[PDB]
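User: Modeling request: complex.
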Amino acid sequence: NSELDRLSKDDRNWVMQTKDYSATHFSRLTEINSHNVKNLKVAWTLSTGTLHGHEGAPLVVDGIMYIHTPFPNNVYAVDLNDTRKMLWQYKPKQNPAARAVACCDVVNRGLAYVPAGEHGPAKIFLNQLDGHIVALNAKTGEEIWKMENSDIAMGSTLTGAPFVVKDKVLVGSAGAELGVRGYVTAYNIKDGKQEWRAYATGPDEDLLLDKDFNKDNPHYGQFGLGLSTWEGDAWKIGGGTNWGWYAYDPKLDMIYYGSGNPAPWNETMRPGDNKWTMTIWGRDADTGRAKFGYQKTPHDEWDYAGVNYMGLSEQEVDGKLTPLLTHPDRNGLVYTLNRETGALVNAFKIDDTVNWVKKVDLKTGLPIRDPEYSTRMDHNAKGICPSAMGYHNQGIESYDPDKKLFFMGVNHICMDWEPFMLPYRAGQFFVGATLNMYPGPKGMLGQVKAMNAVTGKMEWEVPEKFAVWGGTLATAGDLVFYGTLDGFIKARDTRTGELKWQFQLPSGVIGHPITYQHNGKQYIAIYSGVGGWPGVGLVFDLKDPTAGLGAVGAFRELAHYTQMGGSVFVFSL
Amino acid sequence: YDGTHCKAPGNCWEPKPGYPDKVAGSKYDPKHDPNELNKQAESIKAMEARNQKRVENYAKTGKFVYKVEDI
Ligand SMILES: O=C(O)c1cc(C(=O)O)c2c(n1)C(=O)C(=O)c1cc(C(=O)O)[nH]c1-2
Ligand SMILES: [Ca+2]
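Assistant: Request completed. Predicted assembly structure:
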């Protein structure tokens, strides 16, 4: 949407979760910088009125901040000239049973926006946990339309944010842990009418493939593979949900995202590459037809669900300026592809302890597996890095184009894993493994890292007590901001990693910081409200270390630092 | 099974040592009830039909109505 793109270049605005269509998470604002951030103070706050995990972040457009909450997914608008008053509120009535089919807390990754046009007034878009996509009037909160995307009776939910391109809004999927077969859907923004729908598994017509699909890299695989890499009908419950983030190149008219893990976690129950789970897609905007598709983790054995963010950039590849996508996957590899051809440029380890894979062979595109860290029935696999939580999860990261560095919140979590047989019943969990998780070999649960994505060169690396889950914001002030699960927002010098500032928020952070200008002054905002997967133990009062799909044992110390919460914090000088 | 030996372009899965080619009729046969398998897709078809009802009704009246029994 070219009007939305244009609003995104205005530093008064934060118009989409990813900030802009390249997901740069980078601000040109410099009032707050490495030499004065030590004086950053709380300017004002809000309560969201809920507990549970607060993912995503606020949007700001034309002088209005928009706030969203975990279930039941309340939405509020606040005029920045009157920060104490709520301009409008929208309170969904949802079946409480939606909570029981959410794997990983009742989180929501937030709102999308589109400005006024032929369709006609400016709109806020909300995905509800109960499977609905809703269009609200951005100025008044009036419900314009509402459609059913996903059915909670099938264990099918929504947690990923909607994503606007042209006259469409895209809605993902969730519930691979309950055997949901992944799919993404485009709706018309005027109407709410379904334009196209692309499944992650099954016949080619469902996959929605260009006739030139994977022309540039035939060795990735082309047609029929959504059936032939599964045995019989096992694809129909085969996962590949997309609950992460998107990117869009307006000039190529292409949308990028990742499909998640195959179901069940029990690898032995689903022989085959299990395509097209765990795939980086590039799809035509209008038709949804994939031009390319690269499967990062064939026949997943570890739940490295391939939904992580896509960061677009323009960098030199062997002396030639090349349009790229960069993608830190759950599997602990950082992928950079040519975003036009899909060709692989690099795939390097986010941390040297990744052991499921020895290396990716860049010419074949194939990860060379280490059978010592495989999973399989009738075996307890020990010391696999990364764990199912990943060395990287749902945080949106940031890119400074002057330095050519990505800054990333990283996890350092390893596991043991044994599968078990189980039946599929629609509406019930369909996991089939028992895990124990613990710190990686360096001994802490998180890191923050700055890297070049073409060369794989690590500029700096620093440790954190907990996994850094919520992502990052980088600025031309030479700063990277992020929140921690233990309840700090922090700022680091982007040249060195030196810690310049921190503040004690009430609860842990699992979403990202934003920055914007209003009335000539720079602000930073963030949610505080711990939850999501790391927080399941404290949110649900769980004590078995294998509960919360393995997370409880790894994160048992978290509750000594933070309780639940739900607030918005805004900082300024 | 190291992932590099390919039956076909984009198809490189091999059984691990001691494990079968096919699971049907093995001790790891998932034995899926084809009626359970098909439930997702039928519930999607019914969501799509209700949605198309709401769209047509917005087209006919200019007023959006969610509940399909009030149409
Ligand atoms: O298979 C799925 O569709 C699915 C859904 C979700 C979700 O909707 O939040 C998560 C996951 N998988 C998952 O693998 C995961 O690590 C995860 C972490 C979280 C969270 O927000 O902290 N959600 C989810
Ligand atoms: Ca998953």
